[PDB]
């Protein structure tokens, strides 16, 4: 919905750095 | 037996957060000479000295100079500070004799008691410092002829894995304990902060782990565990944009065992943004709690604050919950609210106005408070309730004379 | 407090007297306590 | 019945045991204060200076209610 | 004397508005109270637990000192 996929958009793009 | 899911939704959506950082030893940062405060400089120094230590161990005379100079300032500051401890101890042994210094007793407010009947129990010698702090914890209704305080809250705070004041892992812990022969209350909370990068070595990238536990015997006979992992970074959409994500797990362990019981899983996001003259701070969350026997229950929550340049004194906030109980196709239960505040000064007084809207029951709540530290001109409105009391007195005095 | 560990003595006295001939009664309630911290 | 005997015993216990003890402790406190001001005058007599100019008794009990440092 | 007479005289006219009891029913019909300030608290006993709000957390500074 909104706070499952976009709650993993931030998780994936935080994993994209570290 | 688990708390309602609105409790978790309120707990996971409470604004834009900011984690715990490194604290610096002031005599070795800015070697000898006095300093000032700035977050980026201290964060730079902490990672800079670990880097120079690694390069100095590898060889590299330019790093060895910097690390040796830091070591010199470190030794000088440490010896100065122990000299200050010796001077303070000698001054205390001069000012009092072999006597000690005694704290103030706690003030509990007025009572129908002589108010020094038990004040001699809270005046004690200091001990000065051991690392932890204690406060007493008080209940709402105490016993009649005694002091109301029953429990003790302990607080500890440290930074364990540092090399010479260049710390690693900020850490703190808080435990409330109330023990008697009938009941037992034991609450606890711990936070651990982990720093991955600071500028100019990267962007500011910090994660934080929180754990908490709840024991309350013999009322509940189950214990409560919560764990939160949440990560923040400054950026991701533009320069200096404070974004963060996080997850939360919770359980009600049956008999104390953390392997059995109902569970709660939740995730959250935060962000800030600046478009036009509008600056907004928003956060949102979704919780997927398990019921006692019913199964999945899910909820959505969101908060927003809209800062505004022009009219820089109007505060306005918006809040939303959505509830999804079983039979989800026709039980979507929404709720949203608005809040406005403003602030004036007139007639030698400071006025503040707050307007609140709940939007399910269409009610507007207005609340104005004033404060006049100059005169009693603000009391002219006091004639409003004084008339009606008279109209409720004579009408009583008529009916009491019939 | 001699380096902690207090020494000395302490005495407390309290008297409560009812003055109403009103719903409460005529009473007199007295308490005395005595503590000695001896080496 | 015995209650007036209790009242008379409480008044007698106060007037014969509690009042002189508090009076003696207070008198020791003013003698200690006079020792303080005698030492201050002796210190300023050790130099070639003037007298310390203590305040009067009204100021003494009023400052006893309204100190900032001890 | 004049002021405390004129203020009460205006209060008599302004307080004598029509109806005067339907608004009592409107105010008391919302027996749910005004919404109260949120704090983080424990689930079992409701004692407050500490918060990390950025507008408060950005003012905080700590340091490290040697122990005795
Ligand atoms: Mg407690």
Curated annotation (Swiss-Prot), chain D:
Subcellular location: Plastid, Chloroplast outer membrane
Span of the annotated motif AKR2A-binding sequence (ABS) required for chloroplast outer envelope membrane targeting: 23-31
Source organism superkingdom: Eukaryota
Membrane-spanning ranges: 2-22
Family: Belongs to the TRAFAC class TrmE-Era-EngA-EngB-Septin-like GTPase superfamily. AIG1/Toc34/Toc159-like paraseptin GTPase family. TOC34 subfamily.
Function: GTPase involved in protein precursor import into chloroplasts. Seems to recognize chloroplast-destined precursor proteins and regulate their presentation to the translocation channel through GTP hydrolysis. Functions as an essential component of the outer chloroplast membrane translocon (TOC) complex, which, in turn, catalyzes the import of nucleus-encoded precursor polypeptides from the cytoplasm to the chloroplast.
Subunit annotation: Homodimer, heterodimer with other TOC proteins, and monomer. Part of the TOC core complex that includes 1 protein for the specific recognition of transit peptides surrounded by a ring composed of four proteins forming translocation channels, and four to five GTP-binding proteins providing energy. This core complex can interact with components of the TIC complex to form a larger import complex. Interacts with ARSA1.
Name assigned to this protein: Translocase of chloroplast 34 homolog, chloroplastic
Gene source species: Chlamydomonas reinhardtii
Higher taxonomy: Eukaryota, Viridiplantae, Chlorophyta, core chlorophytes, Chlorophyceae
Protein encoded by which gene: TOC34
Region of the whole protein represented: 328 to 397 of 397
């Amino acid at each position: 919905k909104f706070i499952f996929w976009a709650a993993m958009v931030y998780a994936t793009l935080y994993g994209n750095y570290e | 037996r688990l708390p309602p899911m609105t409790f978790f939704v309120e707990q996971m959506s409470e604004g834009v957060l900011k984690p715990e950082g490194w604290a610096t030893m002031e005599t070795v940062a800015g070697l000898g000479e006095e300093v000032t405060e700035d977050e980026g400089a201290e964060s730079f120094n902490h990672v800079y000295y670990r880097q120079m230590y690694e390069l100095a161990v590898a060889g590299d005379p330019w790093a060895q100079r910097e690390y040796a100079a830091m070591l010199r300032a470190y030794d000088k500051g440490c010896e100065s500070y122990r000299a200050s401890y010796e001077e303070a101890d000698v001054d205390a042994n001069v000012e009092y004799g072999v006597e000690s210094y005694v704290v103030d007793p706690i003030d509990f407010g007025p009572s129908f008691d002589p108010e020094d009947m038990y004040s001699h129990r809270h005046a004690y010698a200091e001990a000065a410092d051991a690392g932890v702090t204690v406060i007493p914890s008080q209940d709402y209704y105490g016993p009649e002829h005694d002091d109301p305080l029953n429990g003790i809250v302990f607080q500890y705070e440290a930074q364990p894995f540092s090399r010479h004041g260049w710390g690693g892992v900020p850490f703190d812990l808080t435990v409330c304990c109330e023990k008697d022969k009938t009941s037992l209350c034991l609450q606890g909370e711990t936070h651990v902060s982990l720093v991955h990068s600071v500028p100019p070595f990267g962007p500011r990238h910090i994660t934080q782990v929180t754990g908490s536990w709840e024991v309350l015997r013999p009322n509940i006979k189950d214990v409560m565990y919560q764990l939160e992992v949440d990560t923040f970074k400054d950026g991701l959409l533009g320069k200096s944009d404070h974004a963060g994500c996080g997850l939360m797990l919770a359980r009600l362990g049956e008999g104390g065992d953390p392997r059995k019981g109902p569970t709660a899983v939740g995730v959250r996001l935060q962000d800030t943004l600046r478009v036009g003259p509008f600056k907004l701070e928003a956060c949102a969350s979704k919780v997927a709690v398990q019921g006692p026997t019913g199964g999945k229950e899910e909820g959505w929550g969101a908060r927003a604050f809209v800062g505004y340049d022009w009219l820089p004194g109007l505060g306005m906030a918006f809040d939303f919950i959505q509830e999804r109980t079983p039979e989800e196709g026709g039980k979507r239960l929404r709720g949203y609210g608005a809040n406005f505040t403003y602030d004036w000064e007139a007639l030698g007084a400071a006025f503040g106005m707050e307007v609140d809207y709940v939007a399910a029951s269409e009610s507007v709540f207005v609340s104005v408070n004033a404060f006049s530290g100059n005169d009693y001109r603000l009391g002219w409105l006091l004639l409003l309730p004084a008339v009606n009391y008279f109209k409720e007195t004579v009408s009583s005095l008529w009916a009491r004379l019939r | 407090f001699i380096n902690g560990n207090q020494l000395g003595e302490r005495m407390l006295f309290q008297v409560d007297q009812g003055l109403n001939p009103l719903s409460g009664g005529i009473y007199n309630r007295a308490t005395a306590s005595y503590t000695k911290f001896l080496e | 019945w015995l209650l007036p005997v209790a009242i008379a015993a409480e008044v007698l216990f106060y007037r014969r045991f509690l009042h002189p003890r508090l009076d003696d402790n207070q008198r020791r406190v003013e003698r200690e204060e006079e020792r303080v001001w005698a030492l201050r005058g002796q210190q300023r007599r050790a130099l070639g200076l003037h007298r310390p100019h203590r305040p009067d008794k009204d100021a003494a009990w009023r400052l006893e209610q309204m100190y900032d440092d001890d | 004397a004049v002021k405390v007479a004129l203020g009460v005289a205006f209060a008599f006219w302004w307080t004598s508005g029509p109806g005067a009891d339907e608004e009592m029913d409107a105010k008391a019909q919302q027996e749910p109270d005004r919404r109260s300030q949120y704090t983080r608290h424990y689930a079992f006993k409701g004692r407050g637990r500490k918060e990390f709000l950025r507008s408060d957390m950005k003012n905080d500074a700590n340091e490290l000192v040697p122990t005795r």
